[PDB]
Amino acid sequence: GLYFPQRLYTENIYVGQQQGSPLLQVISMREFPTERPYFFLCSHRDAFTSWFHIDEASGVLYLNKTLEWSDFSSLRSGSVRSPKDLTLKVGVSSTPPMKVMCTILPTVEVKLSFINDTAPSCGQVELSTLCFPEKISNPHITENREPGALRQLRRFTHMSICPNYTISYGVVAGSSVPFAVDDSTSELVVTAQVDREEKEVYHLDIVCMVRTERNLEEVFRSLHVNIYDEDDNSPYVNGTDTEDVLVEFDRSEGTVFGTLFVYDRDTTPVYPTNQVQNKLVGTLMTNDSWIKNNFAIEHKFREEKAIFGNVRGTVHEYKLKLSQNLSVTEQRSFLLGYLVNDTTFPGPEGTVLLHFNVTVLPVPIRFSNVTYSFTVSQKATTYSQIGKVCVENCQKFKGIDVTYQLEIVDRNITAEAQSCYWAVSLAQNPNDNTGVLYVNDTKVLRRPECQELEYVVIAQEQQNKLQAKTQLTVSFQGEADSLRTDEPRFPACAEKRQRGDCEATRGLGAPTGRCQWRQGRDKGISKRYSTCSPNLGTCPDGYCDAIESKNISICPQDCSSEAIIGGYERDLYGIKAGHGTCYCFEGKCFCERDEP
Amino acid sequence: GLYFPQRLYTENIYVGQQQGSPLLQVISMREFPTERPYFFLCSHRDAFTSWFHIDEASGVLYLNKTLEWSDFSSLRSGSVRSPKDLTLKVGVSSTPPMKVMCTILPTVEVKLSFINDTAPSCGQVELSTLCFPEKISNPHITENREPGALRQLRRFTHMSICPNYTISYGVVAGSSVPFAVDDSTSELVVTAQVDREEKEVYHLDIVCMVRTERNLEEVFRSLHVNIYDEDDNSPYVNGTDTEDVLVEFDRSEGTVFGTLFVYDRDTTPVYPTNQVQNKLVGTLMTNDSWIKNNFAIEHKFREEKAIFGNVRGTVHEYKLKLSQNLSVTEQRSFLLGYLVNDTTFPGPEGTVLLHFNVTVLPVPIRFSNVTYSFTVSQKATTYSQIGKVCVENCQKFKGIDVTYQLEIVDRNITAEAQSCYWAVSLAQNPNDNTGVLYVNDTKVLRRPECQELEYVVIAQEQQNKLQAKTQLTVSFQGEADSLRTDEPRFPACAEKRQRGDCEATRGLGAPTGRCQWRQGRDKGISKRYSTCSPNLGTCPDGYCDAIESKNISICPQDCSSEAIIGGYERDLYGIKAGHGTCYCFEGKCFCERDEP
Amino acid sequence: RLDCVKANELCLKEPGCSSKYRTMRQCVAGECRLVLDALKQSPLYNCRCKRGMKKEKNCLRIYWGIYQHLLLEDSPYEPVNSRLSDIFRLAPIYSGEPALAKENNCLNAAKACNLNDTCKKYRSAYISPCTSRVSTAEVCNKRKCHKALRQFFDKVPPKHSYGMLYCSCPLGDQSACSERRRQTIVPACSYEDKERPNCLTLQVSCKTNYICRSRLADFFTNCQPEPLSLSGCLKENYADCLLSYSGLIGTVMTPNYLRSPKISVSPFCDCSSSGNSKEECDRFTEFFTDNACLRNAIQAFGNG
Amino acid sequence: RLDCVKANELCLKEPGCSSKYRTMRQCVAGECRLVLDALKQSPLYNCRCKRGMKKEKNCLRIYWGIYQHLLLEDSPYEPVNSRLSDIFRLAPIYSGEPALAKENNCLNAAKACNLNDTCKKYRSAYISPCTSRVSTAEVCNKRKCHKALRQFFDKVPPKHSYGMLYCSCPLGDQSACSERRRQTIVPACSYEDKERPNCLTLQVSCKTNYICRSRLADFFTNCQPEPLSLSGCLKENYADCLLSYSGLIGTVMTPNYLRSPKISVSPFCDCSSSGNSKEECDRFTEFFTDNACLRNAIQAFGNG
Amino acid sequence: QGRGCLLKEIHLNVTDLDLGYRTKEELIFRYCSGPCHDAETNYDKILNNLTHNKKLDKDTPSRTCCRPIAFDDDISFLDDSLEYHTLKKHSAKKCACV
Amino acid sequence: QGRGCLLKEIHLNVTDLDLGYRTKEELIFRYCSGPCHDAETNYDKILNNLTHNKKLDKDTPSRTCCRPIAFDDDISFLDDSLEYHTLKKHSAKKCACV
């Protein structure tokens, strides 16, 4: 019950002492006077404890036996080398306690060092060690609570060996700080109550007042006490308690729109985690299953120090989020109210009120009034690229998966004329939510019947099965420049590793039929390394697209995975920088530098 | 009993024949007249045999049934295509025989061909096929035996088709040869007895006497009869019946000294091997266990034709041989008499007498009155060779195994001086029955105390443990020409594969300390191929030495075994010819030609 | 001294030893005092294991079960015979390299490690995984990195290892040396993270894994400061702390050299949101950040 | 046609078949006639095996046991369906090589065999062992040589094999060709020997080994001479004899081309010491030395 | 493993081999000869680079060499003097880049 | 298997490799060097002979090369910009004639 300002009561002991001699007194603090204390020891297990004796009421420490050299040997603690370390325990209740009474209550440790020597010559001591220890502990105090006596400052080692003079103390260099000093028992005492929200730390400077014949001896030591916060502050708000929310093209789960804050002047310990102090619990009061099952709230709290008069303060936060991935044909508008309660505040008011301005809207999956009419400049190659196709507002989609298809308009005709619909294909890209168009066969284009085609593109949203289509026409006007001999077999371009060849190849991904050429100049490993690519638009872009994954001989640069040789940097996939005129083969790559 | 001049009685048969018609008669020969024959068939198993009928006494062949087309089908023999082949058997005893009587006696086969045709037109035949068959057999006769009628010469196929005229025969172009012809039964007959030792073969020329209106037709055929030898000739001798034998230095087993012959005018069939004719059995009549247990006889017989009036005659042979490997301290002289008996000669005398002149002498295992005092020209190398050592008459030993040892004369002296007997060793060669002397260590010669050594050579015959020794002295007078730095490590010489290096190396088997050099010039694979050898005397010689077998880096040429590469010939071990400047490494060899 | 598991096998044979061991595992689970006496006499009660072997997890579990039921105050991990290794492992400075007095020592230690065939291997081993990108979200797999780093600082000879981590060089920041001295443990993976948690929370995190617990029990026990001695330490051994601190690397407590004028060190943590208990965090960090024994120890290796 | 061992497995299942087979193996060892009937009907009574497979020793043993107890006269080794292979194996001449009309044909056959990858292999295989010196007394190991020679003349296609052995070329001796035509089978090892034994003794020697016996039964049966036909043979097949003769090579009867103006052949033997039975030896040798069918057959391949 | 390092063949007389035999027999000789650049490592690139620098005076270590990892069957033949000779490991069966 | 092709070593700066890195770290590079003539077959002799004849115009198949069949452990290092790089299969561990 009665808390202990310190957990360390340390002193030194020596040989040649007598029973019935005071050694130390410990003090306890009570919030109200009806609790009267009664001191006592514990740790009755060991035998050396039978010598120490204590007074049930006053709280001072005595002894019941003298010291002898034989006693030094019987006390063993780890190593045999002096000094020897011992440890004891103590508790204080308001009524006569039993053996079992103190293993339940919180106690404190007493660490006393044992040396096998007698009292020293007291004129050989130094000034620095006269009135204060080597290292010191900083006690603590609690805000908004009754005051009392704090600590003892007499050292019984230096006070019992040379008792020819009297000593006192004093608080020094203080700009009216609420502390004091008694003279009857020379105890450091607190003047009156305090509020942590006003002052957080107390730098001090204490002195020893000694009476000496040569001159009055004053020695200065320093320390500072700490403050303990109790939740005596309810939260408030800056600004408003409302936020605007919009849901148009981002319907994926785990997305966030809103931002609301709150402030509590108290402090929120993170450890231990089984606490409740200044931790805000938020409750909703909406019963709609759709909204509740679909929407999510987020909680995240830190602490700040720069907006409370340079005092450590807490700041909660709250933001909106979705739960699951939503449909495209819904529309609702409402207000969400989310409450908060600081359960550790024993006051009439411990809450605030938030409000969200939610606007859920649907989206139309339709094409534009305009059509898509692509074309091909010249006689092309397999796995090329002509045009993209997307519904209106295609970039801004999120959480929307769409499949694209196409079909012929002339259903059934002679097979010879049916072949002319083998010179086109399609691809699908969930990243950009669009559709890429690439040729498939080239032996079809020779005929003049293929020169014009017509397709009906189909767009099918997965979740709702909605549909939308338009008319597509594709026209090739590139006459064959004396290249009939070549059958459907075209070499790659990633392996020319030179300008001269790469310009005169005809290979995969060649719209014009010639693969592109790059020339990166720099001193060392640069992000611009000379290569040969079919289309520079998306071959070294970084990652690969749906087309790049069809064949391994089409820009391995961004989609390759196997070991690479030479001077290079690389992320997960594909080379970011390689020292010089880099190149590749079917899966294996070698970035080097050509001295010639 | 009664032997058959021929084993083949062949004729042709046709459809449309009658029972009770003669087909053939077979004749048997008897040595004496009291044996009167009685003919009969056998092979009663099959059914077709029930038709044929025979006369118990006369010996002619008849039939009991006619021919019908159905009978042709029932007779099956392998293939169904004409002609069909059948086979019968016949025996002749002097008394009525049972079913069981002829499976025991020797019989003859009758091979008759069946064709499903009738008698042919007789004016369409050719002259060559008129009186004689296509192929013929040569009968045989026995020397010194009673004569008789030999063969029949009427062909019953031709006689029935044109029974108009009469035919006879005759022996033509004969210089008074003992044969004749009958007219009653037109049988070829022998005039009287004969001696095979006079005439071996009888070339003949026989004719057909036909009576024809156009002109008398004479057709000539040829044959020759063979003679059968009976052992009516005892052996004889040319020269003497004695031989000189000597046993001095060849005492190994299986060695031969003598040569004696004999002659029998008879012939000695080699096959079958279960016979006894003109095979000579030799018996000894000596009872001495030492001689009999130690000496061996050899038998080996061929046949000759050029010393009996161009007649095939037999010649036995006999030669002396040892049984086991004999001692060196024996001496005996005696006469061996070895008899022979031609057991197949039913005459009073069927033997001859041989005689051997054996002279067994001992051998002295001793050294010459002279000693062996070798020397070393210069400062040498390990596994060299200085001198051979052998007892008197060492080349001519055979069956004599000898071990050679050596020992120091100064038994015990200071150890430092004891070391000087580490610069010599010994080897042993059972081929030449001698002992080779080779150095072992070179770090010993650097002291002046080693300059003179003395050994007592020891020769110990294995079987008798005899001993013999002399005094050996070895002196080195080759001063060190500034080569102390080299420790006991010397490279090989078989791998220099060049003149220049090989002359300036110091390696194994170098008496002078330099390995020898060869230069074989020729166009292709020659037995003289340039190499580098330690000592040319025995490195490319042939059978590797006792020394050659110590290290593999000492002339692998003659004792290597592993695969070889390039142009080469090789016998069991070592290269006989390799195309050019051949060489070797530690076990692996490469004969090549150096264009430079 | 002897291991624990060997003593475990030993006591599992004697009828009395194992019988009372079971009686005890039952007593502590909820006469028994008389059974305490027998346990103390057994070698197990005083059993302590160490490094260099390949069976420790079981030893540590055994001792933790024995004494946790009946962490920094009383440490098992190191016997009192390590001073014999301590003094000999204070010699490496003379054994390191003849060249000295250059503009940088970290680079020289790296040169020396890329010439020996054990430090080189293990260094590249706990390097490459820490630099391995396995997804566009992650940058590396720390589990592999920490474990490899650990098994390097366990085996490779001290002469070549400590040098790279404790190399001294002229004061300041942005001196090529300090860059490498900081980048020895590749902090981007093994050090950094998105958020800084309070040290006390990380102190509890360490207190569960069976390795960090002991590598931390070693720290306080060795490097404890005392000003009375000229050395500044308690147990008068400069290399004992030198080992104890390096024994933490890889574990949940992966410190590095902060950006401070002096030689300070802190784990990836800060005394934020600690509220009333800013004293405990401050003591922890001060003992870990600004101390005499550790500065003296790290300086000793510098004067080579 | 079907093999014998397959028919053996077949008959070993039927109760009656195997029961009477055992009854019979008992009868012939010393009603039984009624058991003869059942055996004849079984496919086993007419079973015949051939070349190209790898299980023959057992077939040959089976049939020899069946019929020897109850050799040239009635041969098993070849069914009557081989003519179909015979005519097709008379074509090789056209399939051999375009070049022709040179000064030598044996050399051309050798050239053709050292360009195909089966004849080449097997030729070097039965060559090298026959030229291997294994002691100063011996010159080569004949067992290996004969067996390798055999398994070559069993597999390698006739187009390339027969040519080297039957190559024709201008008359005489000491014409480079005849040297090679003679030295094809390396006679120094597979032909020669220190003494010439009588052929009849060698005839009995062959009559025991289970292979030479059949390879000889084929000879008389195929090449039997008859003058009535223009061909000169009996069964009017030039390549049947061509196969039968080549089927002897390797076995105990290893013939080669003698030194005679015409095309004569004799095994390593002579009719010496034959005594009264010079007729049997003479017939044997004449059938083997001077015949029409064989000369015509070997000449047919010559006109290509 | 490189596919440019392939197997070719040429028809020769045995005498073109210059091994000394006198015969009119012939043969098919087989061999491997092509590039193996697609199988190189960092080792080879460093070698190439130090060769081009001339910084290694004389040492010239070998980059990847298309060599035959197995040989064809034995061959036999007769020379002009009617003596037989046999050649082993004379021809490649299947090469690689090692 | 030849004993003349042996493992030698030379101390270099990483920068002498010309791979583009900027660092002051150093290394031990190891490599194979020496003759392999004692391991040759008939194949190589024929090749040598047809090369010296010039009878193969351009084809130049390789004779035995002495090459590594196993590589040393991985190396790591830090460049001047304080970025790490790692090199694999850079140095020989054991050598052989192949």
Ligand SMILES: *[C@@H]1O[C@H](CO)[C@@H](O)[C@H](O)[C@H]1NC(C)=O
């Ligand atoms: C937010 O409101 C608080 C109310 O106490 C005020 O002190 C603070 O200055 C405000 N923040 C601003 C103005 O940025």
Ligand SMILES: *[C@@H]1O[C@H](CO)[C@@H](O)[C@H](O)[C@H]1NC(C)=O
């Ligand atoms: C539901 O409505 C009741 C009032 O009817 C309210 O108290 C409650 O907070 C609402 N939400 C939930 C989750 O109960």
Ligand SMILES: *[C@@H]1O[C@H](CO)[C@@H](O)[C@H](O)[C@H]1NC(C)=O
């Ligand atoms: C050997 O003696 C026989 C005695 O019949 C004689 O015919 C023969 O000529 C003799 N051999 C000679 C003289 O060479």
Ligand SMILES: [Ca+2]
């Ligand atoms: Ca307050």
Ligand SMILES: [Ca+2]
């Ligand atoms: Ca408060």
Ligand SMILES: [Ca+2]
């Ligand atoms: Ca609060």
Ligand SMILES: [Ca+2]
């Ligand atoms: Ca891309």
Ligand SMILES: [Ca+2]
């Ligand atoms: Ca007579």
Ligand SMILES: [Ca+2]
């Ligand atoms: Ca006679």
Ligand SMILES: [Ca+2]
């Ligand atoms: Ca006689």
Ligand SMILES: [Ca+2]
């Ligand atoms: Ca020799």
